[PDB]
């Protein structure tokens, strides 16, 4: 059922394409936060 | 599905706690924006 190894593989992807536009999200706030 | 999942699951799940510990934070960022 490829997508288990695969999607396994794609859901690692999508963790870590998460995790990267996630920390882009974190980013702002200090633009008001330090005013 | 053996090994290389094992490693994958592994950073899956670093992944998923890193995807948390980079949430929280954001969901005790909320409102510093405020504006």
Redesign the interface.
């Known amino acids: 059922l490829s997508q288990?190894?695969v999607k396994?593989?794609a859901?690692?992807s999508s963790?870590?394409e998460?995790?990267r536009k996630?920390?882009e999200?974190?980013e702002?706030?200090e633009?008001?936060?330090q005013i």
């Open positions: 288990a190894n396994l593989l859901e690692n963790y870590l998460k995790l996630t920390e999200i974190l702002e706030y633009r008001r936060f």
